[PDB]
Design an enzyme around this catalytic site. Structure first.
Site, mmCIF file in Angstrom:
data_model
loop_
_atom_site.group_PDB
_atom_site.id
_atom_site.type_symbol
_atom_site.label_atom_id
_atom_site.label_comp_id
_atom_site.label_asym_id
_atom_site.label_seq_id
_atom_site.Cartn_x
_atom_site.Cartn_y
_atom_site.Cartn_z
ATOM 1 N N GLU A 161 43.038 -0.846 25.821
ATOM 2 C CA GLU A 161 43.110 0.302 26.612
ATOM 3 C C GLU A 161 42.553 -0.261 27.919
ATOM 4 O OE1 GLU A 161 42.525 4.421 25.499
ATOM 5 O OE2 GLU A 161 44.657 4.687 26.202
ATOM 6 N N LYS A 221 54.394 12.332 24.231
ATOM 7 C CA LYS A 221 52.958 11.916 24.412
ATOM 8 C C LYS A 221 53.022 10.763 25.430
ATOM 9 C CE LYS A 221 48.724 11.668 24.022
ATOM 10 N NZ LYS A 221 48.765 11.380 25.494
ATOM 11 N N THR A 222 52.209 11.048 26.537
ATOM 12 C CA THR A 222 51.767 10.217 27.761
ATOM 13 C C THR A 222 51.058 9.025 27.201
ATOM 14 O OG1 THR A 222 50.363 11.765 28.662
ATOM 15 C CG2 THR A 222 52.754 11.834 29.429
ATOM 16 N N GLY A 223 50.983 7.811 28.258
ATOM 17 C CA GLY A 223 50.054 6.919 28.432
ATOM 18 C C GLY A 223 49.799 6.438 29.659
ATOM 19 N N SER A 259 47.853 5.502 25.775
ATOM 20 C CA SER A 259 47.562 6.798 24.747
ATOM 21 C C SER A 259 49.007 7.164 24.027
ATOM 22 C CB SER A 259 47.188 8.061 25.762
ATOM 23 O OG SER A 259 45.869 8.021 26.267
HETATM 24 C C1 LIG Z 1 38.598 5.751 26.197
HETATM 25 C C2 LIG Z 1 38.065 5.021 27.186
HETATM 26 O O1 LIG Z 1 36.928 4.655 27.050
HETATM 27 C C3 LIG Z 1 38.798 4.767 28.338
HETATM 28 C C4 LIG Z 1 38.173 4.126 29.546
HETATM 29 C C5 LIG Z 1 38.960 3.967 30.904
HETATM 30 C C6 LIG Z 1 40.149 4.057 30.721
HETATM 31 C C7 LIG Z 1 41.019 3.852 32.036
HETATM 32 C C8 LIG Z 1 42.260 4.166 32.132
HETATM 33 N N1 LIG Z 1 43.199 3.884 33.206
HETATM 34 C C9 LIG Z 1 42.491 3.381 34.550
HETATM 35 C C10 LIG Z 1 44.549 4.158 33.310
HETATM 36 C C11 LIG Z 1 42.978 4.635 30.819
HETATM 37 C C12 LIG Z 1 42.175 4.786 29.791
HETATM 38 C C13 LIG Z 1 41.008 4.594 29.716
HETATM 39 C C14 LIG Z 1 40.261 4.932 28.551
#
Ligand SMILES: CC(=O)c1ccc2cc(N(C)C)ccc2c1
Length: 257
Positions: free
Chosen positions: A136, A202-204, A40
């Site tokens: 992602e 901004k975090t990710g 992110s």
């Molecule tokens: C936008 C999207 O469909 C979506 C779906 C699952 C996600 C799971 C994440 N983690 C398990 C950390 C992080 C971002 C994510 C984004």
């Protein structure tokens, strides 16, 4: 540092560190050119490109969207499929809440990940690799490069939009303000900086225990620090500990203070 290596040992993780004091050009580096899923943190650069594109009045453009645009995490966008949202409001939700539908809508508006890449290359970022919506979940794995960047490139690009000349000052103000009022980073960079200092961040978060934070940190008087702290872990389903980011930041602040 021995100090960063200690944190990798304590947390069973890989750390990527790049910090620049914009008032001295002093630098802190630890795996600064190692790739990590940007996650992110890309939302910040996406808004930078967005602003560059648009005029400020143009941000008041209303975006109508549907339930089909709603993804995994839609804290603001789920509340307004009836009304739609202006581009300005979507930038707010993306940056301050990490609203995933908001990011997707903004990406679409700038012409998608291919267009975001093209615009990052234009501002001098040859490292950052946007390829997919929802970065992602690609994914991917080691040691592929799609939807990755480095601590160095993220700092350099954040600095370019926020502090240098990739944007006019009034657009700079919007980006910086949104990131200052981020709601998602209290336990990350903010928790590693001394009290009362302004922080824009901004975090990710991604698989493989990927936990990221990019930030501008203003000292009381004088020129800000731009920092990227990136982290990942061995196992696809590994969990991250926010405390790694806060402690890493503390080490960075000591190395420059
Ligand atoms: C936008 C999207 O469909 C979506 C779906 C699952 C996600 C799971 C994440 N983690 C398990 C950390 C992080 C971002 C994510 C984004």
């Amino acid at each position: 540092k021995d100090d960063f290596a200690k944190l990798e040992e304590q947390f069973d993780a890989k750390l990527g560190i790049f910090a620049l004091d914009t008032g001295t050009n002093r630098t802190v580096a630890y795996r600064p050119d190692e790739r990590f899923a940007f996650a992110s943190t890309i939302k910040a650069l996406t808004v930078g490109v967005l602003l560059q594109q648009k005029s400020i009045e143009d941000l008041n453009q209303r975006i109508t969207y549907t339930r089909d645009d709603l993804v995994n995490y839609n804290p603001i966008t789920e509340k307004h499929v009836d009304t739609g949202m202006t581009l300005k409001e979507l930038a707010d939700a993306s940056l301050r809440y990490s609203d995933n539908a908001a990011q997707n809508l903004i990406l679409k508006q700038i012409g998608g990940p291919e267009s975001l890449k093209k615009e990052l290359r234009k501002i001098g970022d040859e490292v950052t690799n946007p390829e997919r919506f929802c970065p992602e979940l690609n994914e991917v794995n080691p040691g592929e490069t799609q939807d990755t960047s480095t601590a160095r490139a993220l700092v350099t690009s954040l600095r370019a939009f926020a502090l240098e000349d990739k944007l006019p000052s009034e657009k700079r103000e919007l980006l910086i303000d949104w990131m200052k009022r981020n709601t998602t980073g209290d336990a990350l960079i903010r928790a590693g900086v001394p009290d009362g200092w302004e922080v824009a961040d901004k975090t990710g978060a991604a698989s493989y225990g990927t936990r990221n934070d990019i930030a501008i940190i203003w000292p009381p008087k004088g020129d800000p620090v731009v920092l990227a702290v990136l982290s990942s872990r061995d196992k696809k389903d590994a969990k991250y500990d926010d405390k790694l980011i806060a402690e890493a930041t503390k080490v960075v602040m000591k190395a420059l203070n």
